[PDB]
């Protein structure tokens, strides 16, 4: 999967969570988001001209996905506890993480 | 001013912008936010145990304020053009920057 595919996986599954009815649907979507975040963490932002892995902005790019994965894991803990409404609310807190990286690299 | 004061300056002036009527009110509030962001950039997050300036998470902390200042400057460009509704909307885009740093360090 490429960056576009991983982002649409994140995008579609965030919606699945919002519309979900049980913990299993939420857990399934969060698990898919988690893998897509770690896969996208291997890419580079197309508009960053310096793609060097050790550059500060590439550190920051990968770091943003570690933060996102941490928040996904927080939501998964709630989903695995059966707390559906709570997990859905935690998934909503992802969105500023998405929007922050987008503003900063797009 | 300390970190609490700078954050409440950011907090109060974001509200002033939302309720403003002309470019001058928006510009005045954004200018105050800008100075408070650069002042807060000198502090450290109270819950970060490693306060070393050269550590990655202290780099990230200061970097978040540079991003915020950049967005404030984008909003100021619109305010200085007289585009009040546009400037107010740009100020709204700050909020995920605020919430991102809060989630990550509080
Ligand atoms: C959090 C849950 C999300 C969600 C829902 C999305 N992202 Fe990202 N994203 C990043 C970059 C560099 C791009 C540009 C990619 C490119 O130019 O091809 C994107 C793009 C998107 C899209 C748009 C896809 C398109 O049709 O153009 C969407 C829908 C999307 N993302 C969803 C980088 C990042 C991150 C780096 C740290 C993080 C985190 C996210 N995105 C988070 C999310
Ligand atoms: C963007 C416009 C904002 C706004 C409106 C606020 N912040 Fe921050 N903030 C940061 C840290 C580390 C703290 C904890 C401070 C502490 O423990 O004393 C805060 C706290 C706040 C508050 C709460 C004040 C209180 O009564 O406890 C408020 C209202 C607030 N902030 C507003 C760190 C950062 C950032 C670092 C990169 C950025 C950016 C912001 N905050 C952005 C904003
Ligand atoms: Zn797409
Ligand atoms: Zn960066
Ligand atoms: Zn960051
Ligand atoms: Zn306060
Ligand atoms: Zn960090």
Curated annotation (Swiss-Prot), chains A, B:
Location of this fragment in the whole protein: 23 to 128 of 128
Protein name in UniProt: Soluble cytochrome b562
One Gene Ontology cellular component: periplasmic space
Chain positions recorded as heme b binding sites: 7, 102
UniProt GO MF annotations: electron transfer activity; heme binding; iron ion binding
Keyword annotations of the record: Electron transport, Heme, Iron, Metal-binding, Periplasm, Signal, Transport
Protein's organism: Escherichia coli
Subunit-level organization: Monomer.
Function: Electron-transport protein of unknown function.
Cofactor(s) it depends on: heme b
Cystines in this chain: none
């Amino acid at each position: 999967a490429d960056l576009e595919d991983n982002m649409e996986t994140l995008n579609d599954n965030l919606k699945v969570i919002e519309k979900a009815d049980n913990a299993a649907q939420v857990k399934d979507a969060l698990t898919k988001m988690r893998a897509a975040a770690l896969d996208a963490q291997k890419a580079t932002p197309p508009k960053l001209e310096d793609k060097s892995p050790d550059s500060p902005e590439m550190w920051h790019f990968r770091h943003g996905f570690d933060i996102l994965v941490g928040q996904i894991d927080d939501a998964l803990k709630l989903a695995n506890e059966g707390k559906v409404k709570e997990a859905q609310a935690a998934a909503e807190q992802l969105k500023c993480t998405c929007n922050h990286c987008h503003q900063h690299y797009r």
